[PDB]
Every structure is written in structure tokens, then in C-alpha cells.
Symmetry: D3
Subunit: 237 residues, 6 copies
Amino acid sequence: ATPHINAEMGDFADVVLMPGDPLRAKYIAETFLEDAREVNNVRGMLGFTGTYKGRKISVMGHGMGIPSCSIYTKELITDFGVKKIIRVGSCGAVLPHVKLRDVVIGMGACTDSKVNRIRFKDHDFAAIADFDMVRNAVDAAKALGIDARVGNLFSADLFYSPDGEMFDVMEKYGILGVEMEAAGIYGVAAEFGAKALTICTVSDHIRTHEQTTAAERQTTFNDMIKIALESVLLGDK
Amino acid sequence: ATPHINAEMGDFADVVLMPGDPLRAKYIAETFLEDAREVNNVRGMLGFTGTYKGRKISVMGHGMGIPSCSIYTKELITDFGVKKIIRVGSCGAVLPHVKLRDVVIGMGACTDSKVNRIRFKDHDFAAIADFDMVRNAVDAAKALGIDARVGNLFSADLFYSPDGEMFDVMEKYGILGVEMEAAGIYGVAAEFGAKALTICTVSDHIRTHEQTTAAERQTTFNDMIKIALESVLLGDK
Amino acid sequence: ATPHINAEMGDFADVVLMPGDPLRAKYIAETFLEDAREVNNVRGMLGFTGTYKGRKISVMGHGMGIPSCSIYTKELITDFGVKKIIRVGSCGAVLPHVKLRDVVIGMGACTDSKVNRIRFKDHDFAAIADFDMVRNAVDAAKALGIDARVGNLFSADLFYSPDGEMFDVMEKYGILGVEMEAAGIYGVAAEFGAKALTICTVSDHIRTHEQTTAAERQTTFNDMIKIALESVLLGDK
Amino acid sequence: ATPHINAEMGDFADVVLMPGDPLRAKYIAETFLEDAREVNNVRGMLGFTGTYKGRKISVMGHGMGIPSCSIYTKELITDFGVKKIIRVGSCGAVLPHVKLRDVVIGMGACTDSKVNRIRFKDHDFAAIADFDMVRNAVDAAKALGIDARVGNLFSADLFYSPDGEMFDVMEKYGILGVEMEAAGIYGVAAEFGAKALTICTVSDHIRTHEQTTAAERQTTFNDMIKIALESVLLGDK
Amino acid sequence: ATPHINAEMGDFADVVLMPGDPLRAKYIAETFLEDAREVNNVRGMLGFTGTYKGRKISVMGHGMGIPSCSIYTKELITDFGVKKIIRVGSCGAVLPHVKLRDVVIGMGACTDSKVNRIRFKDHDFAAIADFDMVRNAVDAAKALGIDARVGNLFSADLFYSPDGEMFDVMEKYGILGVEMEAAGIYGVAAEFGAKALTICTVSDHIRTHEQTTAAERQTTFNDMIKIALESVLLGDK
Amino acid sequence: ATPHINAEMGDFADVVLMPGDPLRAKYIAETFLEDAREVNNVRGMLGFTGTYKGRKISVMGHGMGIPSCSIYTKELITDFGVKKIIRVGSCGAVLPHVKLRDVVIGMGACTDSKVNRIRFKDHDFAAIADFDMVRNAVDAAKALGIDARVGNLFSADLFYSPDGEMFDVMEKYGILGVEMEAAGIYGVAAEFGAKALTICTVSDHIRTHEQTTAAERQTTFNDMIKIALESVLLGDK
């Protein structure tokens, strides 16, 4: 067991899907995994392992923000043999042409956190995904009839930011979505020699809120999870 | 309801105790409060309201790190009428003279997060507690036979820090405990015009690499919660 | 003697009150201290030692700004045995509800200086007063019929700042008064293992720019000095 | 004509290959393009346009460093209709497992320049390539029997850096090659709404000095150009 | 009057010499100026106006550090019509061939203060003297048989710096003398459209740990003042 | 030979004039020098050596931007015995009273590059010229009856800056001309213990869209070159 995960080596697959909400991890296990078993419940941060089309897979919540996900991702890599992390999230769009319910893949992640400056001598660390994982997700999405948008996410520390003008800067530089974790996960992956990817669905536009239904949100979430799971199978071959 | 709290105004007391772990919130509700009811379960971030010696009080987890706790404390203050937040946590000591099981009260909180720089035009914002709350906690502790130490916390973004050299700097400048939230909660309290306090129990010694046992963490935790609750009653009178 | 103080060990009390203006130190000595003698005159930075109700007390100017007061407070602490510094100053208010002639006690001090970033590896050091000293001043003020406000000061490097918009930021985050020294003194106290407090009276408003009469200014100044002196006597018990 | 390019709209293809050295641009034009003509010679920064397998292609030097290449890439995009920039260069390796003469594709580029901080409100902009261009290069390389490494470059401002320790930090975080331009080109592409890619061949290891023969260097350079040109043809499909 | 200078427009000459110590201003007035009038004594910061070789000249202390001298210099320029400021100070040397008693003229001044970053949008402002004033000082020194060194000063915020390694950096980049004010004065001069110069004499060597004797201090100080005064007369022609 | 200069010790004079454009270096060699020989052609960065009134002088292009010129100036100093660098460039004015064709001499150079912060522990290094070289240029200009102003340049990393507002800040602080190299050359000179000067002629006004068209030069540029060359002869006296 590690400080935040009451499990032992072997309990996790070598790839872990991670939504922010642990209750979505439970939903993924129930909906997509065969022979699913709960393998963590410390702090309510539910984690599960089962199989998808014969492939051992785990899913576990990461909590909100770079500091939370950095803990779990580090422990998974250093103590549970995890080689790949796929964050499966929501993001808010700053570009009108990026549509509600689009799938975005963060090949890079911008941020207003200091964590990568702390790592990288106050220089600019380009927080990036693993290329093969990116391509596997693009290809899995294409096989499901989806053209994933590949580019930069922006990982914010403040959900309630006092700097609304920054969203205009994000738009100018082509940021595809705003979320709260990718850059931190990518920094951990680089620090500890593993591989990561963040996939998000566009849940809103930052500038002007758009309504969605629970059913629409569920189906779009499910599409993202299928992309993520199928991408793993492509990566295995 | 707010984006992370499915409750109505009036469901929370005007003071909320907040451990990081929502399971500890449930423990507090069951152990210390009368007639407790669950008022939030969104994302498993359990919150409860009941009474302590006749006084309405709430308790809810805040999750790990500045970004997580900043969400919850903002929503509580702006939309649930919450006037006081008392974080009840654990910390790591760096000073030789600060011992396992000591109770530390953060009158200030240092940080390596960028959030307060973002707020404060890249100058130094001294993230501070409410003074009356500090003195109420000191006095409640004294009535329970505990001499709480009052000073600076350090709120880290990385539990697993690559800049190990910073612990000796914290030690040099008298930091009493290392945790992950206080500076963020204090920044929200200043931004949105409320009052906050962080109380921690020392659960490990970073300098000498000592760790508290299970028995040990629990009994000290109970004392911290009694301090917090009794401090509210002092503040009311 | 030290580079800026031509005195010997024992010439200073273990607590030193420090206004910015050495002529105010002379006034304090003449008005409040018995058997006062001048103990420093280097650079015209007058310092005195005498007794208040039998208790040995010193008073000495600190000059204008963080670099000036950092020199004097360091030398006093390291080489003259000084345990406590109480800055006794004026400040400018940014909050309309903070009134002219109010007493402000700086439990924290924000700043636009780089000195604490230099000390603290470019992270955020919360420059704080000693809690017991704060409580002693609050209690002394209460016994003198004054309700002191306890919160953050802002210690500016530029009395003539080119950034007017920063006052709006200070107001937003609840800064009680603007002065030029507290954060520097608090940094020295932390660096060199001593205790400090800044008490200020509100001399002006950047909002409701009203001034005062000489008589009003003297009476208010003297009330502040009485609070500071009485606070020492509480700390001694 | 623009301030650094004496040419008119149409003189350049919509994709421009850019080595640092203008003499390399001449070599590329002479060796790989049919009906090549010189279209720029301002500042000796030779640029050419011809065809490759019937497809109009341009090639032009970008000079050394972010400021130099930022000028040329901006002018090409805004004034000459250029849609894609492919930098073709050399890099120094900091990882021992990255081998001499390996092909590196910079999906991201770290930097110690301030240019992207100036663009991005002092936050972290992840300077990234266009994903489709990256995949096209990977595929073109595979068709030529070369397995390209895809990951981060580091774009240095100082070829002669006084901070030797930084190469160790680059190695820790997995940087594949050190060069001087990619992060700047990627910043311009984001700013002005175009697409870019940097392909480098490993010319040496920064810490250990290794030798190559003329035939080896010629083979590897030619291989890089073939990858670049063939990647364009894939993108066109 | 201003709060810091109790004088009227006309009371100062258009050129003011400024040592840090107001008692040295008094010495200068008594020793070098004919019929000098005391024009300020607020905060003990003595200032005088008299005549030197037919020329009206003022001299006034500036106190210790950038914030102090920034107040006085701004007020002199914007409230008293002052056109030229000549700081006359002592400095510490780091270079092996800079010797005790050497005269150093600060054509530039490096600093660890934030004041010029605040002014200059967080970019690097080169804090420089007025060229003609520098040349006038070199020429005056030569006529007095003194060979002055012209180069960079370093203006420190902390006389007692916790970062001893910075002296190595100063030495590496050729800093001639370490003092506490020049960069601040030069920033004010640029902000408010006036001209300034800092002349220092080397009173201590930071590496050899030697200092000038009392007799040497007086002689070198007198020579510096003669250079300053004679430089004004050259400027007038 | 060095990595960017294929020549041997002795091939360069101990003084090198450097325009950014190597074709201007050729022009200078063929117009102003006797018995000029091309001594470098790597990357087309033409360098020449000949004599001016019997004095051995070299001239070589430095390319655009701080990173480019930093390479060449370092190599010249450390491997070719070069003692003095005179950059001879163009610049843009922000001050209305600075006119087209004015010759500007950069006693200092401000910058938005990070290179001097990297050198100088993130403090403010005042990037300055050698005083004697500045005075030699001033004196040569006077003897030639050519007007010249001495003050600060601003060395930009982005010719195409997204921050137009910074030009108003430059104007406020008295910047004489905007170019792209001086601060980098001055940093190298300090790092490697040599001497440098930048002279520029105002080619355009950033305020009054006028600048210099086809005509202006040749004669204005020629004026700057004559000043530079004659300044060397004065420095030899």
C-alpha cells in the first residue's frame, strides 16, 4: 500500500483510465469491464480492475486539480507497475468552432500551475502526451466515426479564476479545451519515466454556458471511454 | 446547488469543518455531531450537518490540494452563506523541536502555488487566517490541556516534491508544518470576504523521517476536532 | 558596536519600539520613558533606553523602507540581544470602512519587495508577526478602550508607485493599511529567530483622502505607543 | 516584399522546409527540387522554390535562434500564404539511449526563451507541432525504413550556456535533443494560425564527443530531407 | 514642503549631492560649501544649499536603500526642480584587481530589487547614469590626479544577504562595487526625466576582508566630493 | 576554427565591427578597408579583415537576435583574441524628438530576453557598453561633425511583438532605439571579460510611421561606420 492507495502490486493493470470523479470510475467499471473488482477505496477515491475484450484494465478517480492527480499518478507509476495513464475528462472550449460534445486529445497541455517550473529550473517545460498513445486514440476514435481534435489543453489551478482575460489569450493561441489536470499528469509521466494521455469531451463553452441533458452527457462520456479502451488495444499490437 | 455541491442554502451551517478526506468528514459527523444528516455526496465529497452542544455545524471533505479545496470553499462561501471554514488536517514537521502529535495552527500559510500571485499581480500576498479564529482555537486547546503552536504552515502543490532542498529552507524560516491546502483556503477567504483557519496535527517528521502509527493518528485527530468545535463555541460568546 | 549602531551589549532592552522617524523615537523616550538615555546616534538614527513602569524598554528609528529597517532590526537581534521588535507607524487605508485614526495590527504583511522571495527560493513566504505579540497588543488595546483591527498590511517599496491599480487589488483582498516596512521586519525576525509586530495608525485614505489636525495626530500616536508599551508588560507575565 | 524577404506572393510554395544554414537551403534545392529558382537572398538568407515529384516546395534558411527564425516564419505565413513550416536541423542529445544520427521529431519543444511567456501572460504555453504533420513524418520515415523518435526538443537561447546543470535537468525529463529554434517556430505557428514541425538528426551527444564520417553525415542529412518532403506528399492526400 | 522635505521651491540648487548619511551631508556643507543654509531637517535627513566656486550646490542625505533614496530623489526632481543628482557613497569590491580607495563610477547599476521590474513590465531595464555626468566625473578625477574605474555597481536590498553565492556571480560579470541605492536613483531619474550619477569609493574588499582606516576614509571621502563638485562645473560649461 | 567561424587565430583583428547583415559586412570591407580579405564564410556569415588608416580591423555579420550574435561574439573573444566588438546596426525610435537618421550610441541596453537573468541569478543585470568605447565614439562623431545621442537601447527578442503597449513604456523610460542584439553582446562581453559597444542609426519611427525608405542611407549608415572606425583609432591613443 502507498499513502493514498490501499492495494498491492498486481491489483492494477499496467494501464489505468482516470476520470476526475471516483463515481465515474465506478460507472466505467460497471459498464465496460468484465469481472470488475474494487481495488482502492481510500479517501473514497474508488479504483477498479477488470478486463476489456480480454485485456486487463484499471480505472480510478484522480480528484480535482494538479496536486490531487499528481499524487495518484506518481504512486501508480512508482508502486503499482503502471506504464500508461489515460485521463478521461471534460473540458471547456474557448474557440467557437470547437463544438459541444467534440472529443479533444491533449497532445500538449499549457498551464498556470508552477509545478513544471519547479521541476524544470523555471524554464518552459512543454508538457506533452506520449505520441503513440495520441495516435492510438485518434485511430480508435476514427474507427468509431469520430474525428478527434488534437492540440493543446490548458490545465488551470482555479476553476473560479479571477482572470477572465486569460481565456482570450487561450483562444488566440488555439487552445482546444480548459481542464485542471493534464499538464500535471504529463509532468509526472516525464519525471517518473512513464506515458500519459488526456482525452476530454467538450462539456461547455467557457464564455457562454450551453445546456446539456444528463443523457447527452452520459452518451458522450461513453464514447470517450470506448475511445480510450479501444486505444489501449491498438497500442498492445 | 453549485457545480460541486448538490445542496440548498440552509443545508450547511455558517461554519464548516473540513478534513481533506470525505470519509473523515463522515467519521466526524457520526462521532461528534448529533442528528447528523448527509447534505452532499457529489463526487463522493461527503458533507454533513448536525449539532454540537446545540450549535449547528457542518463538516465536509475538501479533497487534496489547493485547486480542490479552492472550489469547495468558494462555493460554500458564495452560495451557502458560510462565514467560517476550519480546515482540520495533518502536516509534516521540519523543525527539530516540532514533534509527532503536536497541534499546529496556521496563522499564516506559505506556498509554492501560483494562485495567490495570479490574484495579487505577482506580488507577495501573505495568506492569513482570521485572528479571532486563531485565538479561539488556542484557547479551546488550552482548556483541553493542549498547548497548540501558532505560526506558518507551508502549502505544497507536490506531495512528492523534486525540490527536496526546500524543506531545509522551510526549517530555516520557522515553518511549523507542511500540508497542501491552507494558503489556498486563505486566498479564497480573502477573495470572497469570509474567515478561515487551518489546524493540523503533526503526522510525520520530514527531517528525521518518523511516521505516526494508526492508534496515534486517530487519538490526536479526535483532539483536533474537539479543539475546532469548542473554538466555534468560544467565537460565538 | 555594529556597522550602523554605535552602542554596546546591554545598552538596548530586549524589546525595541521602532517608529520610522528618529525624531519620533526621541519624542517617545521623552514622553513615556523614565531615566531615558540616548544609546545611538549613527546616521542620525536616534535610539534611547529607559524604563516604562519599571520595565527596561528601548526605542529607535528604523528609517524608510525594507532595506533600511532590515539593517537595524538584524543588528539589534543578532548583536544586541533583542528578542522583540515592535514597529509603531502610520499607514494609508484602501478600504473605505477602515477609518482615519483606526489602529491596525499587522498579523501579516504583503509586499512588492523581492527580499522574501530571495530568502524563500522564489516561493511565497507569508510574512507574519509573532502570535503572542499580536494577542498582547490586541489585549492592551482592549484594556485602553480601543478596538484594533487585525489583518494584513502591505509593505511597499515605492511610496511613489507607478502602479495605481494595485490599490484596487489591495482593497479587493482586504488589506488594512499600506506602509513600507512590516514585511521586511517580519522576514528578518524569521531569518534570525526572533519575534516582531507592526502596529500602525491610519493616517490617511487613498479613497476618502481626509487629513487631520496636529492635536489629533499626537493623541492617536500616543494611544499607539501606550498600546505597544502595555503589550510588552502583558507579554512579560 | 517583406522586411527580410525580397519576394512576392506566389514565389513560395505553401510549405517551406527550413534548415538553419542558408547554404543548406541551396544544397537542398540543388539536390532534391526540379526547376529550382532562387526567390530570396536578403541578408544572404537564401530561399528557393521548385518541385518535388510534381509538388511545389520551397526551402529557405532561418538563421540561428528563436528571434531569427521567428522573423522568417512570421513573414512567410502572413505575407506569402505559407501554411506549413518544416524545420530540418540537427540536435544534441542528452540521453545516452538516444543514438548518434537518430531522427528526432519534436512533438513539443521546451525552452529557456521568454518569448512564449510574453505571448501567454507569463503562464506555461506548451509549444507543440501540428499532429498531422508529426504523423506524416513518422509514416514517411517508416516507409524509408527509419523509426523516428517523437518527443520533446529543448530550444536554447545560449549555444554557450553558463548553466551546465540544465543538461542534467533536460535528461531527467526526457528531452530528446537540444537545438535553438523549434519552440519559437511553434509559438509563431500558434500566434499566426499555421502549422509547423521540427525534424532533427542527432549530430552529437552534448556530454560525450563522438565522431562521424562524411558519408554518414550525408546519408543522414539526405534521409531527413527525404522524410520531410515525403511527409508533405502524405499530408496532401 | 513635502512630507519628507520641509522646504520651498527655490531652496535647492538644480544639482544635489547625496551621501547616505545625513551627517556626511552636514560635513560636506561645512567643509566645501560657502555660506550654506540648512534647508531640510525632517526625519533628521539634513539638507543644505550653499555655493562652490560661484555655483549654487545642494547636499542632502538619502538614507539607506532603494525605497529611501527613491522618495527623496523623486521629491527633489518633481517638487524642487532638481535636474541632476550625484550620489556619493562607499562600496564593497568583489574583483581581485579593484583595490581599497579606488574610485568607482557607476555607468550602470545592477540590482536585486523589484522596483525597475515594476516600472518596466517585468523586463530588464538597464539602470544607467547620464553619460555626460559620467564623463564629467572621469574628467574631474583625472584633473585631480585620480584614475576612476567606470562600470557596473550592484545595488542590494539586503546589506545582510542570505545569498553569499551572489558575490561570485557579481565577480564573474565584472561588477565593480556593491552598494544599496544607485539602481533606484537611476530608475527614478528615468521615470521622472532627470539625470543622475553614483560615484563610490571602495571602503572594503569582500574577498580579502580588509577595510579602509578612519584616516583613509576621510581622505578618500574628500577626494570623492571634490570629483563630484568639479564634475558639476564641467557640466555647466 | 570554432563551430561557427572557419578561420584561425590571427585572421581577425583585435577589434571587430559587426552589422547583423553579412552583406553589409562585405560592403564595409570593400568600401572602408584597404587590402580586405574574406576570412569567414560559414553559414554565409561573411567576415573580413583589412586595414583602416594602417590599423588592422575586422568586420563580420552577427545575424539577427540575441542568440545569433551571442554565438559569434563568444567565439571571437575566446578563440580569436578579440578584445573589442562594435555592433553597427539599425534601430527604431519611440521618442518623438529622436529623428530619422540620428545616430544612437547604446551606453546601456534594456531587454525582454531571459539570457541575462539566466546569467545573473534572476536579478537585474545592467547590460552596459565599455565606457571608454562609448567616449571614443562620442569624440569621433564630434570630430566628424555627425550628431549622436547616448543612452539606452532596447534589445527585443520579437521583431513582431504581440505587446504593442511596451513601446509606450520604452518611450516613458527614454529608450533611444529598439534593436535585437545589444543586451546580448553586452552580456557576452561581461561573461567573457571583453569590451563592447553598439551604435545604431534610426531607420524608422515606431510613433510616426515614416522610417527610412530606399534612399536614406547609404550616407547615414556610412556616417555610423566612419564613427566606429575613427573611434577605434581614438581608443588606440
